[PDB]
């Protein structure tokens, strides 16, 4: 074979990542037309912040290395990108009715936590909902053991 060293005298391997494409090959759960909404304390009440495709893109953990997930919202315009936020255990999504949901997420840019919601037909709706919950219960599965068998 070869062999050379130059400056860091410290590497993982030849096929680093680093150059590899973002090979991101993620996983599409469930895909369907949303739309979103959040409260601006504001006008007190639900106000337009983008409408268009929604869907359930899985990925993978870094300090975990398990299966991960996200909450992503394309619009139907330019498929633009407003709510991009990463699930957590202690995430909170609540079912408030049959076609509307509320759900806890981070912005891109404010990057801060507000209450957001899910407008969808009734079948629709407990869909991307029945998804949710689940990307949830994976992750308190593991921050605990669970019930020790005596």
């Given at each position: 074979?070869?062999?050379?060293?130059?400056?860091?005298?410290?590497?993982?391997?030849?096929?680093?990542?680093?150059?590899?494409?973002?090979?991101?090959?993620?996983?599409?759960?469930?895909?369907?037309?949303?739309?979103?909404?959040?409260?601006?304390?504001?006008?007190?009440?639900?106000?337009?912040?983008?409408?268009?495709?929604?869907?359930?893109?899985?990925?993978?953990?870094?300090?975990?290395?398990?299966?991960?997930?996200?909450?992503?919202?394309?619009?139907?315009?330019?498929?633009?990108?407003?709510?991009?936020?990463?699930?957590w255990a202690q995430m909170?999504?609540?079912?408030?009715?049959?076609?509307?949901?509320?759900?806890?997420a981070m912005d891109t840019?404010?990057?801060?936590?507000?209450?957001?919601?899910?407008?969808?037909?009734?079948?629709?709706?407990?869909?991307?909902?029945?998804?949710?919950?689940?990307?949830?219960?994976?992750?308190?599965?593991?921050?605990?053991?669970?019930?020790?068998?005596?």
């Open positions: 074979g070869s062999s050379g060293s130059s400056g860091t005298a410290r590497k993982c391997l030849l096929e680093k990542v680093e150059v590899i494409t973002g090979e991101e090959a993620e996983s599409n759960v469930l895909q369907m037309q949303c739309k979103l909404f959040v409260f601006d304390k504001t006008s007190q009440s639900w106000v337009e912040r983008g409408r268009g495709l929604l869907r359930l893109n899985d990925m993978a953990s870094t300090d975990d290395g398990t299966l991960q997930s996200r909450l992503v919202m394309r619009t139907q315009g330019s498929l633009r990108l407003i709510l991009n936020t990463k699930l909170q999504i609540d079912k408030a009715s049959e076609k509307s949901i509320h759900i806890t840019e404010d990057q801060g936590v507000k209450v957001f919601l899910i407008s969808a037909s009734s079948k629709d709706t407990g869909q991307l909902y029945a998804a949710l919950h689940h990307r949830i219960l994976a992750l308190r599965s593991r921050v605990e053991s669970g019930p020790s068998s005596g």
